[PDB]
């Protein structure tokens, strides 16, 4: 009786939300950006190839100086690279080799990683002893760690395969806030530039917008047909892009609370692993299972270019904070640095 | 740029120290053979191989056969959904699949799990070392006659023991029909697709069986040997 009535009320609320979004869908982003000129052909060359990982690379993250980057591989190795010289700054042997994510702290003093061990491990890069040591192991997730991002030297947000995201106090080792509401494995998260909000994409084909301080879900974004594997905030924080297993990338707007544009091609039938924006947000770079990275025009949904330099799955990519270069990691155990030329 | 030159030499020196360590790790990594252990709760996968270390939720077993190191990984502390974390093991030497043969109710469940692993895009080149565990209980169940396989598998009514079958001495003919029908049920899946890139190695094993480590060693040799033979157009 009560249960049957409640699930009927959910359908009424879902229709109410759908009508509200349709009411404000006066125009389409495609129609708005039809007049603007295209970006042309985007040609990027492999400036650097980072060799030394002996297994599939699963994650990478640039440091805020746009020169150092950290990559994680399932050979049990965290490597910090000097991208300008290709020198290896550090090589951190992991206690558990099944790492799935890595994060570089904005201060540059810490890196984080974690995988099937259900632990987010924090490593101190600046010690008087001259070596990298484990400073914290964040336990509490009951599933694999899929993504982690530092807010500062003391706070980090993690997404897990136990359908929850958590905000951690690194000094105390306890999760201050738990973000629940996903019905599938949360695969990725992206922080807003002001670090007051973050979006997460899960395997329930939905993206949720979370308030960091309040700790509740503000908005829910649907429209994908399969698991979301990647998510990235637009540079101004008012939008985000997702990548799913349905071979599509979608651009959602926070304030309009709905999808604005879909980035898919008929030839593309493979899943999407990673998404990122250029510094101005005009370019959306996406990694695919077919070993390639497609550069999209974010405003016009045009495939601007292709990064074809890997012999296995493109597992991750990222654009520097200054926008100078993009790094791509792959299951073929290599990282490549790309940028254009005048 | 005297100060800059000093930093470049220090960074170059630091890189060389890392590479020397990475060379040592390369020999250890390539010498070890990694295995994924899969099975339901009813199957006794934890007692298949007679060094066991619990690293977080993942249970690891390290055993050595003829100076060859095998690292078997058992994923314990995860939700029942596995389509995401199964991709972590796309490069293992083989997958150890353990099935409770006596349990007819969950037999189709194991077949469905085996089907997904065999046909997954990221596991298309991984052989499966199938262990049909608890064969002693299957013999007791068949001889008792309380439960019939035809109730769950109607094909078994018109199934006959293969000519190549090698029944154990002093084994009832009704037992070897049940043993090989279950094995053939898994072989129907493994021979449907694969294109010679991976093969399924089924074994009949009991709880008191100390030869399972050697069987994994033998099958792993066949898996890599067939990969080498196929590469040289010899297979």
């Amino acid at each position, epitope marked *: 009786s009560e249960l049957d009535q409640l699930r009927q009320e959910a359908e009424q609320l879902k229709n109410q939300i759908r009508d509200a979004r349709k009411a404000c869908a006066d125009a389409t982003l495609s129609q708005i950006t039809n007049n603007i000129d295209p970006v042309g052909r985007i040609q990027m060359r492999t400036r650097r190839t980072l060799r030394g990982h002996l297994a599939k690379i699963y994650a990478m993250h640039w440091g805020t100086d746009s020169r150092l980057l950290v990559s994680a591989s399932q050979d049990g190795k965290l490597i910090i690279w000097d991208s300008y010289t290709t020198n290896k700054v550090h090589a951190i042997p992991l206690r558990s080799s099944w790492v799935m994510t890595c994060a570089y702290a904005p201060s540059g003093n810490y890196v984080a990683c974690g995988g099937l061990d259900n632990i987010c491990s924090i490593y101190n890069l600046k010690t008087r002893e001259g070596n990298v040591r484990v400073s914290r192991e964040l336990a509490g997730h009951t599933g694999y760690l899929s993504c982690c991002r530092f807010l500062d030297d003391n706070q980090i947000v993690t997404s897990s395969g136990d359908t929850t995201c958590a905000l951690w106090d690194i000094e105390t080792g306890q999760q201050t806030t738990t973000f629940t509401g996903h*019905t*599938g494995d949360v695969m990725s998260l992206s922080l807003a530039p002001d670090t007051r909000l973050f979006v997460s994409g899960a395997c329930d*084909a939905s993206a949720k917008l979370w308030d960091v301080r309040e700790g509740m879900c503000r908005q829910t974004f649907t429209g994908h047909e399969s*698991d979301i594997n990647a998510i990235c905030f637009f540079p101004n924080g008012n939008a985000f892009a997702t990548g799913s297993d349905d071979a599509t990338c979608r651009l959602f707007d926070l304030r309009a609370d709905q999808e604005l544009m879909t980035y898919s091609h008929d030839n593309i039938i493979c899943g999407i692993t990673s998404v990122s924006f250029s510094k101005s947000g005009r370019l959306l770079l996406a990694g695919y299972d077919d070993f390639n990275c497609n550069v999209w025009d974010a405003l016009k949904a045009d495939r601007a270019g292709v990064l074809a330099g890997h012999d296995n799955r493109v597992s991750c990519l990222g654009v520097t904070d200054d926008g100078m270069a993009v790094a791509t990691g792959s299951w073929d155990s290599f990282l490549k640095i790309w940028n254009g030329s005048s | 740029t005297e100060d800059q030159r000093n930093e470049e030499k220090a960074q170059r020196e630091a890189n060389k120290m890392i590479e020397k360590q990475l060379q040592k790790d390369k020999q250890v990594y390539r010498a070890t053979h990694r295995l994924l252990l899969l099975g339901a709760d009813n199957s006794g996968k934890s007692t298949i191989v007679k060094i066991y270390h619990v690293n977080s939720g993942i249970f690891e077993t390290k055993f050595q056969v003829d100076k060859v190191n095998f690292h078997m990984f058992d994923v314990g502390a995860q*939700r029942d959904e596995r*389509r995401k974390w199964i991709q972590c093991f796309n490069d293992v030497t083989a997958i150890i699949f353990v099935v409770d043969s006596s349990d007819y109710n969950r037999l189709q469940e194991a077949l469905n799990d085996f089907k997904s692993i065999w*046909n997954n895009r990221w596991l298309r080149t991984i052989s499966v070392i199938l262990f049909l565990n608890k064969q002693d209980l299957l013999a007791e169940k068949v001889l008792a006659g309380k439960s019939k396989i035809e109730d769950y598998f109607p094909e078994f009514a018109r199934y006959t023991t293969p000519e190549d079958a090698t029944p154990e001495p002093g084994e009832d003919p009704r037992v070897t029909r049940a043993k090989y029908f279950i094995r053939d049920e898994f072989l129907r899946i493994s021979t449907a697709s694969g294109d010679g890139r991976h093969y399924c190695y089924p074994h009949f094993t009991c709880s008191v069986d100390t030869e399972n480590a050697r069987r994994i060693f033998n099958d792993c040799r066949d898996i890599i040997q067939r990969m080498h033979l196929r590469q040289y157009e010899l297979l």
Partner: nanobody
Amino acid sequence: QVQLQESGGGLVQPGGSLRLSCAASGFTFSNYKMNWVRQAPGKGLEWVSDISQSGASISYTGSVKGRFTISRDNAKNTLYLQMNSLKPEDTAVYYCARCPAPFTRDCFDVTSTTYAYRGQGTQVTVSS
């Protein structure tokens, strides 16, 4: 939003016939393999039958083989399950489960406790 609505079912005498319908929305129905999953009272979910993307490949569980027929209509975006000669052991909640990814032969987690691409289910009762 991906949503599946199971319709049909109810109280049927043993030996009767029953047809189940699954209405698909929020995804390209022709790109996914579809499954039928049931959960008997006091028991966990079990897989019943599946049908490939084009309907060429069809499978069943041995307990319902010869009595259940599964068909799909890609144009109608609908999935069907014809259940004739029913048995009291078939009393269960029937679920319409979609395989998680398109253009795949594997189908991993349809018979899982909390699966996102599985419908609310329809109740089928055979006990007299």
